[model samples]
Target: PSFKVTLINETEGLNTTIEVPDDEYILDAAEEQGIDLPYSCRAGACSTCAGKITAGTVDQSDQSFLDDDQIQAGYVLTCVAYPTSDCTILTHQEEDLY
Candidate 1:
């Protein structure tokens, strides 16, 4: 089954809607739409691909990038993250990080 996801680039003022396979990663959806999101390690280790889930729920394939506090604050790793519901992501908008 294919799932629809909405990505909002809070910094670049770009909003994209993509339909991906149920098993596709959020990064894959971004790449399919030609969004330039930096990623050093495609795996869930580095924080380079970290993003915030602002509006809905996501089922992260791996939660290693986030701690309890970060997860509680809505931080997610796009490389391994998958949407569990219709979601809106806040990317390139973290004041502390970038």
Candidate 2:
């Protein structure tokens, strides 16, 4: 299934709404839409592509940077985050993690 993903890029000061398949990563989907976002390790081993999920859920089983507490707090590794439902995400949230 596909879900509506709203990406609010704080650094670019842009908001993008796109459709993402459940198996696709949010980062790749956003890039496909021409929405450039911060990123370092595309494998979810870094915080550069961190974002906050204000609504909905994502399957970030491949992520390694964020712990259980951060995940519970809505932080997601966009590079590996696969939306499981409609989601609104605040991009460039790595700063907030620290």
Candidate 3:
């Protein structure tokens, strides 16, 4: 399914919307569209591409690093996060998931 994603980065004064499939990872989706968000491992093992979901839902089943509180706080690993619904998120977030 296609999901609407709104990306925001206050630090860079960045904001844009993109449409991605449910199976597509967030960072890859953004990258494909020239979004250029932060990243490193490109796997679920790191926090380099962390972000906060300001709205909507994503599946982070593969991201076992985030604690319950972090997930509840909207923190997500974009590298592994896949949009499950229309999403609104804040990029460039630096949350200590450890």
Candidate 4:
């Protein structure tokens, strides 16, 4: 299945929406569409690509830099996240969450 994923980062002037496959990683999807959100160590071990799920269903396979409390707050590593359902995500989140 495919879903719509909205990436919002006001400070970075990135407010882009793209279609994503339920099985495709969010970072991969964004890159395919040429939407540069932000990332480093694409291996999913850094908060450089972290974002929060504001309104949607996302499942991540990796949680390298984020802490347990951060996960509870809906933070995710975009490099490893799959949009299981249509959703909106906010970027440039607090790095302390990592």
Candidate 5:
């Protein structure tokens, strides 16, 4: 199924809403909609595309970083995160990891 993804880009201070399917990563979907977010690697190995999910859930099973506790706290790797439902994400949050 497809879901609405509301991205709050802290870097650009912009907001973008994109449609994401369950099978597609949030980063890829955002790019498809002409919303350039951020990322170093397309895979989940890097945390350069990290974001915090303020609302709803996403499947980040492909992510290699973020611990279970962080995931529970809403941090997700946008490169691997696939929305499971409508979601609100705060982008450019890689710095928060430190």
Candidate 6:
């Protein structure tokens, strides 16, 4: 099934939304919405696409990149992160980053 995902760019107040399959990664949702979130290696091996989950829950395939504290504090690596439920994400604006 598909669920609504909301991406809130805190820096620019740009809010983008997209419908994503429950199995889709957070990065995929961003791309589907045409939001360019910084990413490299497109895996959970790096923190290049890391962001905070201000609301809702996500289930990551792997949590190696983020420490326990970060996870507890809502930090997530978009590439390998999938939502277990509908969610809202807070990250830098795609355009503002450049």
The lowest-lDDT stretch of 10 consecutive residues in candidate 6 is 89-98
TM-score of model 4 (CA atoms): 0.87
Tens-digit lDDT track of model 3 for 10-91: 6777799999988999889899998889887777787788899989999989896678898999999899999999999888
Residue-level lDDT tens digits of model 1 in 1-98: 76667777756776877776667888988898788776778888867878887787888858576678888888888889888877777775334344
Q: Model 5: per-residue lDDT, tens digit, 1-98?
A: 89999999756977877889889999999998888888998788877999999999999988998888888888999999999999999998988988
| Maximum-TM-score candidate | 2
* TM-score winner, 5 or 6: 5
TM agreement with the true structure for every prediction: 0.83, 0.95, 0.91, 0.87, 0.93, 0.83
Q: How far off is residue 67 in model 2, in Å?
A: 0.9
- Residue 49 of model 3 has an lDDT of 86
Deviation from native of the Cα of residue 55 in model 6, angstroms: 1.1
| Total clashing pairs in model 3 | 0
lDDT of 2 by residue, 1-98 (tens): 89999999655888878999999999999999888989987998999999999999999999999999999999999999999999999999998999
lDDT of 3 at 32: 94
- Evaluate all candidate structures by whole-model CA lDDT and list the values in order: 0.76, 0.92, 0.87, 0.84, 0.90, 0.76
Give the top-scoring candidate (lDDT). 2
Ranking by TM-score: 2, 5, 3, 4, 1, 6
Q: Judge candidate 3 against the unseen true structure and give its global Cα lDDT, from 0 to 1.
A: 0.87
Minimum summed lDDT over a 10-residue window in model 3 is located at 89-98
TM-score of candidate 2 to 2 decimals: 0.95
Off by over 4 Å in 2: none
Cα lDDT of candidate 4 equals: 0.84
- Total clashes in model 6, counting residue pairs 3 or more apart in sequence or in different chains: 0
lDDT of 4 by residue, 1-98 (tens): 89999999887788888999988899899889988777888787878888898898888856577778888888988989999889998876656463
